[PDB]
Design a protein around this motif. Sequence first.
Motif, PDB file in Angstrom:
ATOM      1  N   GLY A   1       8.513  -1.124   3.721  1.00  0.00           N
ATOM      2  CA  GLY A   1       8.334  -2.199   4.679  1.00  0.00           C
ATOM      3  C   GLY A   1       6.873  -2.559   4.847  1.00  0.00           C
ATOM      4  N   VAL A   2       6.618  -3.813   5.208  1.00  0.00           N
ATOM      5  CA  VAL A   2       5.260  -4.287   5.414  1.00  0.00           C
ATOM      6  C   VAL A   2       5.114  -4.846   6.831  1.00  0.00           C
ATOM      7  CG1 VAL A   2       3.652  -6.140   4.855  1.00  0.00           C
ATOM      8  CG2 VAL A   2       4.615  -4.742   3.028  1.00  0.00           C
ATOM      9  N   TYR A   3       4.023  -4.472   7.499  1.00  0.00           N
ATOM     10  CA  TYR A   3       3.744  -4.927   8.864  1.00  0.00           C
ATOM     11  C   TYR A   3       3.334  -6.397   8.785  1.00  0.00           C
ATOM     12  CZ  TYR A   3       1.456  -4.644  13.565  1.00  0.00           C
ATOM     13  OH  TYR A   3       1.070  -4.755  14.892  1.00  0.00           O
ATOM     14  N   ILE A   4       4.112  -7.279   9.406  1.00  0.00           N
ATOM     15  CA  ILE A   4       3.813  -8.706   9.318  1.00  0.00           C
ATOM     16  C   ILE A   4       3.493  -9.433  10.616  1.00  0.00           C
ATOM     17  CG2 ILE A   4       5.073  -9.002   7.167  1.00  0.00           C
ATOM     18  CD1 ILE A   4       7.363 -10.268   8.925  1.00  0.00           C
ATOM     19  N   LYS A   5       2.969  -8.707  11.596  1.00  0.00           N
ATOM     20  CA  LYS A   5       2.592  -9.322  12.858  1.00  0.00           C
ATOM     21  C   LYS A   5       1.646 -10.512  12.639  1.00  0.00           C
ATOM     22  CE  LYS A   5      -0.021  -8.469  17.081  1.00  0.00           C
ATOM     23  NZ  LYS A   5      -0.557  -7.441  18.014  1.00  0.00           N
ATOM     24  N   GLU A   6       0.808 -10.422  11.608  1.00  0.00           N
ATOM     25  CA  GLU A   6      -0.166 -11.467  11.289  1.00  0.00           C
ATOM     26  C   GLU A   6       0.372 -12.569  10.375  1.00  0.00           C
ATOM     27  OE1 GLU A   6      -3.414 -11.276  12.742  1.00  0.00           O
ATOM     28  OE2 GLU A   6      -2.245  -9.760  13.823  1.00  0.00           O
ATOM     29  N   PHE A   7       1.676 -12.556  10.122  1.00  0.00           N
ATOM     30  CA  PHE A   7       2.316 -13.558   9.275  1.00  0.00           C
ATOM     31  C   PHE A   7       3.603 -13.937   9.978  1.00  0.00           C
ATOM     32  CE2 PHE A   7       0.058 -10.503   6.723  1.00  0.00           C
ATOM     33  CZ  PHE A   7      -0.618 -11.267   5.775  1.00  0.00           C
ATOM     34  N   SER A   8       3.503 -14.214  11.274  1.00  0.00           N
ATOM     35  CA  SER A   8       4.689 -14.520  12.057  1.00  0.00           C
ATOM     36  C   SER A   8       4.537 -15.596  13.118  1.00  0.00           C
ATOM     37  CB  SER A   8       5.159 -13.239  12.751  1.00  0.00           C
ATOM     38  OG  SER A   8       6.280 -13.491  13.569  1.00  0.00           O
TER      39      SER A   8
ATOM     40  N   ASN B   1       0.949  -1.139   0.000  1.00  0.00           N
ATOM     41  CA  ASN B   1       0.000   0.000   0.000  1.00  0.00           C
ATOM     42  C   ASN B   1       0.993   1.192   0.000  1.00  0.00           C
ATOM     43  OD1 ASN B   1      -0.572  -2.161   2.408  1.00  0.00           O
ATOM     44  ND2 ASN B   1      -2.290  -1.993   0.964  1.00  0.00           N
ATOM     45  N   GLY B   2       0.675   2.386   0.471  1.00  0.00           N
ATOM     46  CA  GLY B   2       1.711   3.402   0.364  1.00  0.00           C
ATOM     47  C   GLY B   2       2.257   3.954   1.659  1.00  0.00           C
ATOM     48  N   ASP B   3       1.899   3.291   2.742  1.00  0.00           N
ATOM     49  CA  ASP B   3       2.275   3.729   4.083  1.00  0.00           C
ATOM     50  C   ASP B   3       3.735   3.578   4.457  1.00  0.00           C
ATOM     51  OD1 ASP B   3      -0.864   2.674   5.686  1.00  0.00           O
ATOM     52  OD2 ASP B   3      -0.399   4.295   4.281  1.00  0.00           O
ATOM     53  N   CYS B   4       4.188   4.415   5.386  1.00  0.00           N
ATOM     54  CA  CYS B   4       5.565   4.323   5.867  1.00  0.00           C
ATOM     55  C   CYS B   4       5.471   3.988   7.355  1.00  0.00           C
ATOM     56  CB  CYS B   4       6.302   5.644   5.707  1.00  0.00           C
ATOM     57  SG  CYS B   4       6.396   6.310   4.016  1.00  0.00           S
ATOM     58  N   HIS B   5       6.534   3.404   7.897  1.00  0.00           N
ATOM     59  CA  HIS B   5       6.550   3.031   9.302  1.00  0.00           C
ATOM     60  C   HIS B   5       7.792   3.545  10.002  1.00  0.00           C
ATOM     61  CE1 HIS B   5       3.855  -0.017   7.523  1.00  0.00           C
ATOM     62  NE2 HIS B   5       3.313  -0.135   8.722  1.00  0.00           N
ATOM     63  N   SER B   6       7.649   3.762  11.308  1.00  0.00           N
ATOM     64  CA  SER B   6       8.750   4.187  12.171  1.00  0.00           C
ATOM     65  C   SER B   6       9.140   2.896  12.891  1.00  0.00           C
ATOM     66  CB  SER B   6       8.255   5.216  13.189  1.00  0.00           C
ATOM     67  OG  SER B   6       9.281   5.555  14.112  1.00  0.00           O
TER      68      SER B   6
ATOM     69  N   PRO C   1       3.844 -12.823  16.968  1.00  0.00           N
ATOM     70  CA  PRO C   1       3.131 -11.549  16.807  1.00  0.00           C
ATOM     71  C   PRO C   1       3.677 -10.444  17.714  1.00  0.00           C
ATOM     72  CG  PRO C   1       1.601 -13.353  16.672  1.00  0.00           C
ATOM     73  CD  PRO C   1       2.898 -13.943  17.145  1.00  0.00           C
ATOM     74  N   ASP C   2       4.048 -10.825  18.934  1.00  0.00           N
ATOM     75  CA  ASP C   2       4.580  -9.908  19.941  1.00  0.00           C
ATOM     76  C   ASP C   2       5.826  -9.129  19.519  1.00  0.00           C
ATOM     77  OD1 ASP C   2       4.946 -12.918  20.356  1.00  0.00           O
ATOM     78  OD2 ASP C   2       6.781 -12.154  21.296  1.00  0.00           O
ATOM     79  N   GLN C   3       6.514  -9.612  18.491  1.00  0.00           N
ATOM     80  CA  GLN C   3       7.715  -8.944  18.003  1.00  0.00           C
ATOM     81  C   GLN C   3       7.382  -7.671  17.221  1.00  0.00           C
ATOM     82  OE1 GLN C   3      11.436 -10.052  17.916  1.00  0.00           O
ATOM     83  NE2 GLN C   3      10.499 -10.569  19.893  1.00  0.00           N
ATOM     84  N   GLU C   4       6.105  -7.489  16.884  1.00  0.00           N
ATOM     85  CA  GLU C   4       5.632  -6.316  16.140  1.00  0.00           C
ATOM     86  C   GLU C   4       6.541  -6.068  14.945  1.00  0.00           C
ATOM     87  OE1 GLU C   4       2.864  -4.738  16.680  1.00  0.00           O
ATOM     88  OE2 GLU C   4       2.446  -5.969  18.452  1.00  0.00           O
ATOM     89  N   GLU C   5       6.741  -7.117  14.160  1.00  0.00           N
ATOM     90  CA  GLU C   5       7.630  -7.065  13.008  1.00  0.00           C
ATOM     91  C   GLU C   5       7.187  -6.342  11.754  1.00  0.00           C
ATOM     92  OE1 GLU C   5       7.453 -11.168  13.423  1.00  0.00           O
ATOM     93  OE2 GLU C   5       9.593 -11.447  13.821  1.00  0.00           O
ATOM     94  N   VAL C   6       8.136  -5.618  11.173  1.00  0.00           N
ATOM     95  CA  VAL C   6       7.913  -4.955   9.900  1.00  0.00           C
ATOM     96  C   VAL C   6       9.049  -5.459   9.005  1.00  0.00           C
ATOM     97  CG1 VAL C   6       8.004  -2.792   8.638  1.00  0.00           C
ATOM     98  CG2 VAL C   6       6.737  -2.921  10.768  1.00  0.00           C
ATOM     99  N   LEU C   7       8.678  -6.140   7.922  1.00  0.00           N
ATOM    100  CA  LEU C   7       9.636  -6.701   6.965  1.00  0.00           C
ATOM    101  C   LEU C   7      10.024  -5.657   5.925  1.00  0.00           C
ATOM    102  CD1 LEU C   7      11.130  -9.187   5.949  1.00  0.00           C
ATOM    103  CD2 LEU C   7       9.140  -9.681   4.522  1.00  0.00           C
ATOM    104  N   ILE C   8      11.328  -5.465   5.740  1.00  0.00           N
ATOM    105  CA  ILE C   8      11.841  -4.451   4.817  1.00  0.00           C
ATOM    106  C   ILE C   8      12.602  -5.092   3.658  1.00  0.00           C
ATOM    107  CG2 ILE C   8      13.286  -2.389   4.653  1.00  0.00           C
ATOM    108  CD1 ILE C   8      12.991  -2.139   7.728  1.00  0.00           C
ATOM    109  N   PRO C   9      12.246  -4.744   2.409  1.00  0.00           N
ATOM    110  CA  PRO C   9      12.951  -5.334   1.266  1.00  0.00           C
ATOM    111  C   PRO C   9      14.373  -4.797   1.151  1.00  0.00           C
ATOM    112  CG  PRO C   9      11.520  -3.624   0.490  1.00  0.00           C
ATOM    113  CD  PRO C   9      11.196  -3.806   1.966  1.00  0.00           C
ATOM    114  N   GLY C  10      15.254  -5.596   0.561  1.00  0.00           N
ATOM    115  CA  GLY C  10      16.641  -5.198   0.425  1.00  0.00           C
ATOM    116  C   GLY C  10      16.882  -4.110  -0.597  1.00  0.00           C
TER     117      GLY C  10
END
Length: 223
Positions: free
Chosen positions: A172-179, A115-120, A182-191
């Motif tokens: 980056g994509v928020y992947i808490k629901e693909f982990s 989508n077009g969102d950014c994350h901190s 979930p508690d790690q609050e992960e955001v996957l970032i492409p290289g």
Amino acid sequence: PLMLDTAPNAFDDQYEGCVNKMEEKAPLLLQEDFNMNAKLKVAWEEAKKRWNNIKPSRSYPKGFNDFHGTALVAYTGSIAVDFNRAVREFKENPGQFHYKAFHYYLTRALQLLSNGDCHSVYRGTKTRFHYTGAGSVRFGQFTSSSLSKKVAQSQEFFSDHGTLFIIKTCLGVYIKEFSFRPDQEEVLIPGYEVYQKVRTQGYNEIFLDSPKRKKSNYNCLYS
């Protein structure tokens, strides 16, 4: 201490123009990766189990399938260390990259979830990284991160002798629901995300900002 750079040796395929070609040959390629990488085969099987348990929850983007969900879950597991290494050192020894299909499915999973969102986000490391003080930075390999600074500075990832990366990501994509966690609050970032504004702070903090997508060195290599 490791030097930050633009990761010229990293496998960074974005699969521009060959998605359909890859979606049809990847199943065979994945089977081959497994035959050359027993650890990956076990890791995939474990992630498939987890994926099947969580997928009934929500719905997914058009085109998103079990290979994508499973690849994401797998990245949140133990195969990440070897996979990240393999990607990072690709150019140095391409004959030993036994993640041809895995890399594709994970990349495609992230792209479909775009989508077009950014994350901190934040990422802590045990290894100290140094910024030369000028120029852009890229990792090449996929990298994980957390919405939680506490997670990033936890003993699992961080040491005062290491580095804390403070990052603004826009790919980056928020992947808490693909982990697996979930508690790690992960955001996957492409290289292939490149940070154009980089700043050293103190002795163990590095700020990565002004992210942008940049054309990769490799494209549709195994298509």
